[PDB]
RNA sequence: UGGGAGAGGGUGGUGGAAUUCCCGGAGUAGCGGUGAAAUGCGCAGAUACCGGGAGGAACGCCGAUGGCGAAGGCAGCCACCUGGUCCACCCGUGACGCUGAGGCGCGAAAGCGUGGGGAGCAAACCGGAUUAGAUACCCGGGUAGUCCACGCCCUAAACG
RNA sequence: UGGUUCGUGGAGCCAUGGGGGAAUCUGGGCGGACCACCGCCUAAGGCUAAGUACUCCGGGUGACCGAUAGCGCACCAGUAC
RNA sequence: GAGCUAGCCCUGGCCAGGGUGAAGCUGGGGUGAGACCCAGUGGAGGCCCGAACCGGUGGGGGAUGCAAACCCCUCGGAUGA
RNA sequence: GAAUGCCGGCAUGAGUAACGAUAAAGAGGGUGAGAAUCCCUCUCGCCGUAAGCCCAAGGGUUCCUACGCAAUGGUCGUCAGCGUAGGGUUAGGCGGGACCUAAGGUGAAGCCGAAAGGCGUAGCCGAAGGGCAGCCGGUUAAUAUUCCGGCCCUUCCCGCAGGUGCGAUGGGGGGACGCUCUAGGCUAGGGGGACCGGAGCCAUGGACGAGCCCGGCCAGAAGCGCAGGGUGGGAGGUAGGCAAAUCCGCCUCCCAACAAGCUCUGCGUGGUGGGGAAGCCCGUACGGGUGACAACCCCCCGAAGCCAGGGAGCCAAGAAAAGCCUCUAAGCACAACCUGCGGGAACCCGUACCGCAAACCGACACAGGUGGGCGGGUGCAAGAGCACUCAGGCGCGCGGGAGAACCCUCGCCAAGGAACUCUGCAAGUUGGCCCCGUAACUUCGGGAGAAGGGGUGCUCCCUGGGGUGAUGAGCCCCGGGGAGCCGCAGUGAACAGGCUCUGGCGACUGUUUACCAAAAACACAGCUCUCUGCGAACUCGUAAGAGGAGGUAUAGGGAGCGACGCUUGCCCGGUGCCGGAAGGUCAAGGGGAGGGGUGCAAGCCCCGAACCGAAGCCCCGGUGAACGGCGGCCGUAACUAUAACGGUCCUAAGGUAGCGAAAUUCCUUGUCGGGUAAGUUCCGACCUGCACGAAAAGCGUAACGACCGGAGCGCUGUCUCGGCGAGGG
């Protein structure tokens, strides 16, 4: 588990850093994989789109294999559990017996020396990716595609887990971590096991420093602004917003459902 | 105190240069006003 | 040494009845509740009937005035790990025993921290009924809590 | 919807963006909603000088000015600054 | 017009010298094993003092000034947002 | 004749303010028609982590020399950064380009846009990032890593010489990277020397002495030597590195497990080459000669610099591409490629001068601003601080007198110390190191330098440790103990906190109104709500497209609160939001009952009522860490008083906990107490809260604050109450 700090100075009594003992003695990464420079940015054509994003430590993107069907029936042995700064989830190295090296999301329980196989075969135990038409109902799973041959798009964050609740013909329903029961295809691949490193919620940033180091710039409260920029802004001392809580563009931000109701993907959705 | 004009030949030539004015249609019309009124220096002499 | 009993404890897995919610079929003028009613649910089709899905908590008969542990307590079943206890043999050790201020460990329920989980029950809370009044006993709801992992509380009709 | 004096007005005519969607002279358009009679043209392809507007340039003239005027400049001026 | 100024991206550079002594580790005490408690090493921090540097707190001067924001004493930060 | 009118000229203020940092001047001798200001010499003062040297920007003749002083210089001027004229900037090795790529830009393919034009993987451009071959001296008035001298290197092109399957924009290795802290060995720099070489000098009382003063180096191929970095080697199989592959990757057996070896750097050494002071003599504004056959030796300190891609720890997880090596394919194996030796070729641009400043930006020779490198010695514990001073460079381009008021800056003061005053505003006290020594409280770190005290110089003696020389001398660090001396004073000068109690507000470090507001404002970790199933929600754009994000519910957006401890009650009637295939209202459209206008007629053209018509609104529910609100009157208890109690009206409901004359209380200096002698401020309470109140959060809260308020001790020209003295005007 995580380690806290003694309050030798302030902002340390609360600051808690994660446990780096599960990481194998592989602190520097592996090249021929990750040769991509992370395009550090905050705007599209200059104008800011996502506000309060900037600063942050320089990182290098580690290319992750989400197409596990490129090597069906080909086993691979892990030899390194590494840390990825682009993700909350840790990663693992895949030394295929074929010779290829590839990074995979490291679920919990995946230890060194254990080998991983992919395809419609490869029995049920961690790492082994199978299509949803062959995974048993009532199991823990992650890295799920929603559409076939498009890549893993579901449950990639730390500690998340998806569970199969039933079956509908060639489709398989899923219990997502948000509680939604989505009807996805059966041929969509999915990696069994829970993503692990569930203690990412348990960390406490301590000060403003780690927010700036992660790249999150200060979030200005809307009431401190003025009426030309924000609706809440203005008035005298501490305006009690005087109108329904809206966003800087005029839309309400408390209880307004924003998904499209004429969406064609709404017929594969059941729950919240 | 640090004033407004901190010279730089690089910035001056990439900003008010002839090759920078010939690209934009607004800058191309800039040179039409200077030629028809007869300017001796269409663009700022940068060295 | 050789056997035995047992809800002894911890972990993992697993089963069925029932409640609640949802989907579908079919069906109509009520359901519910109490000493009596009313709040409430019900033509926007409920209660009751059937089929399927989901989820959690507890384990019906055996089940007992029974059992086990030092105590608090412990009940579907399986498997692993490990306590404690009894009987036959007279074999070994040769008094190695008893109690225990302090310390240390355990310690029901309620409560607190982090996160999950939440069907039913249910403090606070809303409403109805009762009464002269009713911050209640009765009724329709309903959050924390009841469960789980770790940490903390360390009290009691902890009672033979 | 635009254009025409036409601002929805009885709103035609001339172009159209959207929907439906014919015919080849006894076929179509128009004559200010519409119908009949009577008349005028024959649309959905295109070309065309002349007469018309303008003055960077040249010439001519002036009940136009004469260095604070007249073009910003009679003078190395769109310069110095 | 972002050569001032605000933010961000890419790439480089700078922060003297003193203190404080976290976690870890070694040895010892301790328990059935731990938790834990002493030294010794260790060198953590939007840590302390304080120059370059970045600011601009209090006062005085300045007021057709040296200055269309200045000068003297004092002051804040100074391995970090 | 007027428009704070327009253009030009000249007055007034007026011979007034100023003459641009208080770093400082004086004398003698020259030139000159004219010297405070130019030249030379002597004395004096200033900076010296610069006010001295070297780069990069920017400036673009300012550089050097000759002749000049009408204008520029805040005065003068024989001078100049000024005028006239001439001269001066030499590169294969420095920097940049015929090398590479990042942000970004451009853009073939392709997409979009009324036009202009916009996005756009590949390609290209794009640099103090990578890659690459030169060090030391001498010459000119002005240039030099550029010319000369010595020594050493790099590309190509052509030949013989020896080897090999050579072989590309393609594959792979490598290039290749953070922050903090540091080890080993060297270098730069520096200190000392009884050692070496020097012209000289004994001054004023003493000193011919291990006396004073100056100087005792630089570069340098190959081998060497020392320190350090990078690296395992074979033998098979192989489906992967978008063709092939012996290269790479993956699996197995063997020997290494070493840095042995192979490479690559640094440093020392090295054939040879160069410099060479102080003092005196000369004449330059500046150089020369000599001292010179100059010596060029030994200790010590020693880095932030080198070996460089070193090591350890930590989380925030630390560029790309080419040069280089290897692999192979088309092709070619008379080619081509590698090593080695000759000969030849090596282009374009800059080099001058300023460069914390009189040449850059500020209209000025403007006290402002400007990135990197060297930045010496001594003492103060240290240090880039502070005081002085080497090398170097300056006295800031108006001066001479005088010694009023008044102003700035500075020093001192009797007696009293806050009485001055909005306020100790300002000023003053304390101040560095070492040793005792410390409180309430608390989040167990803190508060802490708490507060408050003692030692601090010099001489002599004894004595302990390290480090470098060998287990010793010397040299350099820290000590410990005992005697003694002087002054009022021993961080003797400079730099170097005044402290304590409590309250308000904000947890804290931070941030902001460039140029009056640095705060209780903003931000912050943390908590809650809500949206968002990925072509996500949201933002920018007409679109393409891009952000989000090459993220995927422990993730992302919005809103509010703003650490932490305890908590956030009632009202869903109104508004917003959420959920409701019922019902009412509801436009275009379908629909045509019927009616109309014309014609002789079929026909043509209009209206056109019931009926079916979505969203929305109405209606039904839920929702307040959503918008918001959270009463009044009358009567009652055995001294009075008050109301635990009861009754009544109205709203959807009728403030709970906690606080309270408050940053909120008008009356109000409410009232009691504490402080003072005297207290509209302050603190602790009572509650009658005009007009606190639970996330526009409520109540507390250790620490922190250039925030605000109150009190006290030490201390002072702040004041009674002023006086004097210096410097600049
Ligand atoms: Mg590569
Ligand atoms: Mg772009
Ligand atoms: Mg652009
Ligand atoms: Mg505001
Ligand atoms: Mg607005
Ligand atoms: Mg207000
Ligand atoms: Mg408002
Ligand atoms: Mg209001
Ligand atoms: Mg939903
Ligand atoms: Mg059923
Ligand atoms: Mg047993
Ligand atoms: Mg309990
Ligand atoms: Mg709990
Ligand atoms: Mg809590
Ligand atoms: Mg009830
Ligand atoms: Mg109930
Ligand atoms: Mg208990
Ligand atoms: Mg007891
Ligand atoms: Mg019109
Ligand atoms: Mg019209
Ligand atoms: Mg049409
Ligand atoms: Mg007609
Ligand atoms: Mg007509
Ligand atoms: Mg036709
Ligand atoms: Mg035509
Ligand atoms: Mg024509
Ligand atoms: Mg014509
Ligand atoms: Mg004129
Ligand atoms: Mg005249
Ligand atoms: Mg800028
Ligand atoms: Mg420096
Ligand atoms: Mg310790
Ligand atoms: Mg600090
Ligand atoms: Mg100031
Ligand atoms: Mg200010
Ligand atoms: Mg002032
Ligand atoms: Mg002081
Ligand atoms: Mg301070
Ligand atoms: Mg400081
Ligand atoms: Mg008049
Ligand atoms: Mg006049
Ligand atoms: Mg005038
Ligand atoms: Mg006059
Ligand atoms: Mg006068
Ligand atoms: Mg006067
Ligand atoms: Mg004067
Ligand atoms: Mg002057
Ligand atoms: Mg002066
Ligand atoms: Mg003289
Ligand atoms: Mg003469
Ligand atoms: Mg001095
Ligand atoms: Mg010095
Ligand atoms: Mg230049
Ligand atoms: Mg200039
Ligand atoms: Mg000139
Ligand atoms: Mg000169
Ligand atoms: Mg002159
Ligand atoms: Mg003059
Ligand atoms: Mg001047
Ligand atoms: Mg000249
Ligand atoms: Mg070439
Ligand atoms: Mg190029
Ligand atoms: Mg390129
Ligand atoms: Mg690019
Ligand atoms: Mg383009
Ligand atoms: Mg473009
Ligand atoms: Mg591009
Ligand atoms: Mg470079
Ligand atoms: Mg070079
Ligand atoms: Mg060389
Ligand atoms: Mg020179
Ligand atoms: Mg051969
Ligand atoms: Mg080859
Ligand atoms: Mg080649
Ligand atoms: Mg390559
Ligand atoms: Mg050393
Ligand atoms: Mg040397
Ligand atoms: Mg030396
Ligand atoms: Mg000497
Ligand atoms: Mg001699
Ligand atoms: Mg004598
Ligand atoms: Mg020496
Ligand atoms: Mg092999
Ligand atoms: Mg291949
Ligand atoms: Mg092979
Ligand atoms: Mg050497
Ligand atoms: Mg040598
Ligand atoms: Mg000499
Ligand atoms: Mg000279
Ligand atoms: Mg440095
Ligand atoms: Mg290095
Ligand atoms: Mg390393
Ligand atoms: Mg290239
Ligand atoms: Mg061939
Ligand atoms: Mg050429
Ligand atoms: Mg030069
Ligand atoms: Mg030069
Ligand atoms: Mg300066
Ligand atoms: Mg100015
Ligand atoms: Mg001057
Ligand atoms: Mg200046
Ligand atoms: Mg200037
Ligand atoms: Mg500077
Ligand atoms: Mg400098
Ligand atoms: Mg130094
Ligand atoms: Mg020094
Ligand atoms: Mg020293
Ligand atoms: Mg000084
Ligand atoms: Mg004094
Ligand atoms: Mg006095
Ligand atoms: Mg006195
Ligand atoms: Mg006193
Ligand atoms: Mg007073
Ligand atoms: Mg007075
Ligand atoms: Mg008074
Ligand atoms: Mg005060
Ligand atoms: Mg003061
Ligand atoms: Mg003093
Ligand atoms: Mg006390
Ligand atoms: Mg401590
Ligand atoms: Mg205190
Ligand atoms: Mg003290
Ligand atoms: Mg003493
Ligand atoms: Mg003495
Ligand atoms: Mg020694
Ligand atoms: Mg004394
Ligand atoms: Mg001072
Ligand atoms: Mg201090
Ligand atoms: Mg305070
Ligand atoms: Mg208080
Ligand atoms: Mg604050
Ligand atoms: Mg700090
Ligand atoms: Mg501080
Ligand atoms: Mg500021
Ligand atoms: Mg301001
Ligand atoms: Mg401005
Ligand atoms: Mg302003
Ligand atoms: Mg401040
Ligand atoms: Mg996207
Ligand atoms: Mg939009
Ligand atoms: Mg969120
Ligand atoms: Mg706030
Ligand atoms: Mg607050
Ligand atoms: Mg509330
Ligand atoms: Mg409502
Ligand atoms: Mg309602
Ligand atoms: Mg409504
Ligand atoms: Mg209709
Ligand atoms: Mg008729
Ligand atoms: Mg409707
Ligand atoms: Mg009475
Ligand atoms: Mg009452
Ligand atoms: Mg109350
Ligand atoms: Mg009160
Ligand atoms: Mg009083
Ligand atoms: Mg007062
Ligand atoms: Mg008070
Ligand atoms: Mg009250
Ligand atoms: Mg109130
Ligand atoms: Mg309030
Ligand atoms: Mg509120
Ligand atoms: Mg308080
Ligand atoms: Mg407080
Ligand atoms: Mg602060
Ligand atoms: Mg402050
Ligand atoms: Mg005075
Ligand atoms: Mg006086
Ligand atoms: Mg005076």
Describe this entry's structure for a reader.
Chain A: Residues 222-272 are annotated as: Disordered. Chain A: One of its GO terms (cellular component) is large ribosomal subunit. Chain A: This is Large ribosomal subunit protein uL2. Chain A: Belongs to the universal ribosomal protein uL2 family. This is part of a larger assembly, with chains A (272 residues) and B (47 residues). Chain A is mostly beta strands and 272 residues long. Helix content of chain A is 2%, strand content 16%. Chain A has one helix and 13 strands; from the N terminus they run βββββββββββββα. In chain A, β11 and β12 form a beta hairpin. The two termini of chain A are 32 Å apart. With 47 residues, chain B is mainly α. Chain B has three helices and no strands. The longest helix of chain B has 13 residues, at 25-37. Residues 227, 231 of chain A line the site of one magnesium ion. Chain A binds four RNA strands through β1, β2, β12 and α1.
In total, the number of strands of chain B is 0
- Counting helices, strands and paired strands, the structural category of chain B is mainly alpha
- Count helical runs of chain A: 1
What does the radius of gyration of chain A come to? Answer: 22 Å
Beta content of chain B comes to under 5%
User: Helical proportion of chain A?
Assistant: under 10%
> From the helix content, strand content and strand pairing of chain A, which structural class follows?
mainly beta
Provide the succession of SSEs of chain B.
HHH
Bound molecule types: magnesium ion
User: How many strands of chain A?
Assistant: 13
Within the largest sheet of chain A, what's the order of strands?
Answer: 8-13-9-10-11-12
> How far is it from the N-terminal to the C-terminal residue of chain B, by CA?
27 Å
Helix content of chain B: 40-55%
Overall shape of chain A: globular
Subunit structure (chain B): Part of the 50S ribosomal subunit.
Family (chain B): Belongs to the bacterial ribosomal protein bL34 family.
GO molecular function (chain B): structural constituent of ribosome
Region (Disordered) (chain B): 26-47
